[PDB]
Symmetry: C2
Subunit: 136 residues, 2 copies
């Protein structure tokens, strides 16, 4: 399982590689079915409701592309992952305009399979109004 | 110094009682002069630059009132304070129309006087556009 901050950061990179692929069939590899997610005022319980919300947002922002990087991750004695990095988005119809904001993810893992059971993402969404006006 | 999460929480509560007063002469009580601050796209180095950025931001939302709560604070072996809570904002002209968003603070302390030398605030500022109406 996850025992060091470098293992924690590698898992977070893997998690966002999956999320940013929008391959929804692979979300269950790293996210618990009972995932408790909070992203600002967006809040869901259950992996199905998480996927629905992402899908509802991909319909409102056609051509949306996202990527993530991280540079500083701590794994605490309580098992909490704090991972600071950046969130990037652009529209395929205008690939030159990229919006980037700092972001931090707070994660709790399932004690059996090591999937994310709690995921709280903090970032400022106001800059993304430069892409599309139908944000989460 | 800071040794328990309870002490970390109380310091963060004191820090935002100073920040939410907007008494810029008191900021230097809890913020180091070399403060490295990041709040979304806003990024400042030095306490004077931080005060100027907060001044500029408040000057365009006259009547702004802010407060902060917290429910989950961790103090790590590295001395990092992660504090999850909420950020509230309203206008003095309509004090019952409040916008509240979740917010997390990342803090690092000066080992000599205990003031904040690194403060990185993460929240969504988009909902606060509702205050302009």
């Amino acid at each position: 399982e996850i025992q060091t901050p470098d293992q924690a950061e590698a898992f977070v990179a893997k998690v966002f590689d999956v999320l940013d692929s929008y391959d929804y069939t692979r979300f269950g590899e790293v996210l618990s079915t009972d995932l408790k997610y909070e992203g600002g005022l967006q809040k869901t319980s259950g992996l199905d409701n998480f996927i629905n919300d992402i899908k509802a947002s991909t319909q409102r922002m056609p051509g949306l592309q996202t990527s993530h990087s991280r540079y500083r991750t701590e794994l605490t004695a309580e098992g909490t992952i704090y991972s600071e990095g950046h969130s990037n988005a652009s529209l395929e119809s205008n690939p030159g305009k990229v919006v980037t904001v700092p972001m931090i993810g707070v994660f709790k893992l399932d004690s059996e399979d090591g999937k994310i059971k709690e995921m709280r993402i903090y970032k400022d969404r106001l800059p993304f109004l430069a892409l599309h006006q139908a944000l989460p």
